[PDB]
């Protein structure tokens, strides 16, 4: 049925590492569009939505839609056995009980093959309507990760405040209180390192820092992250993949 070939095994490794600490067991839903994933954590506080588009594979074939139930810890154990540059191939059959992973290297003719047993996962998917967000912040992913770790060192919660001038992340705790303010910053020289704010009206929301720190494990997937905020909707944290996306949704504290 399914034969999907990744150019660098790295992409899949990054994705799995960016998902596994939030949700351990996930269904990879495979169809003609590609490989998708949606899963909430056990507390139903956060939601992961991944799409790896069929265009991103160097030969994608999926004859019939199928959900591959995978324990991502076992998948990580198996995926460590491939260097970032290995040619990776996923395969699966009709009523699959396992997923076949094949890693190939150049100038060696060395072949690695693994058959990971699948598990049954009862997928509760949620309908996410298209939303016009009050605030959209484009910022370096590493910067957001540093901010999240720094404020998580002091508190469990963070207040995010988006105005036309900039974005303030603030927190308070037993040690004291801290804050980081970023302004819209445009460089012609190094624009990997830019800050964009598209804002129709100011917005202020509170969120759990541990979940944001878990989100930030996707930093290796893109030098850039997008934060989408409005009062009445969960926060959206989006990382572009090149041929797909990885989105995290976080319900606020009220």
């Amino acid at each position: 049925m399914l034969e999907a070939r990744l150019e660098q095994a790295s992409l899949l490794k990054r994705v799995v590492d960016a998902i596994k600490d939030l949700v351990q067991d996930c269904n990879f839903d495979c169809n003609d569009s590609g490989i998708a994933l949606q899963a909430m954590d056990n507390s139903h506080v956060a939601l992961v939505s991944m799409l790896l588009k069929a265009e991103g594979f160097s030969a994608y074939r999926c004859d019939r839609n199928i959900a591959l139930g995978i324990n991502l810890v076992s998948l990580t154990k198996v995926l460590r056995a491939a260097q970032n540059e290995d040619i990776l191939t996923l395969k699966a059959d009709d009523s699959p009980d396992a997923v076949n992973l094949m890693f190939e290297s150049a100038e060696t003719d060395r072949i690695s093959e693994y058959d990971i047993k699948l598990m049954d996962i009862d997928q509760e998917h949620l309908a996410i309507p298209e939303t016009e967000y009050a605030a959209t912040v484009e910022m370096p992913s590493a910067e957001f990760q540093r901010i999240c770790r720094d404020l998580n060192a002091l508190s469990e919660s963070v207040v995010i405040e988006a105005t036309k001038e900039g974005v303030k992340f603030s927190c308070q705790g037993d040690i004291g209180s801290g804050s980081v303010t970023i302004r819209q910053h445009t460089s012609v020289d190094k624009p990997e390192q830019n800050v964009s704010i598209a804002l129709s009206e100011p917005v202020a929301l509170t969120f759990s820092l541990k979940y944001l720190v878990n989100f930030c494990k996707a930093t290796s997937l893109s030098s850039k992250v997008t934060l989408c905020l409005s009062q009445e909707v969960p926060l959206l944290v989006e990382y572009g993949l090149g041929s797909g996306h990885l989105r995290f949704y976080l319900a606020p504290k009220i």
Binding site: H125, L126, V233, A251, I254
Partner: peptide, 12 residues
């Protein structure tokens, strides 16, 4: 209080 994702999006 910490809200839930199902408070904002229905299951489908």
């Amino acid at each position: 209080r910490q809200t839930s994702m199902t408070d904002f999006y229905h299951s489908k």
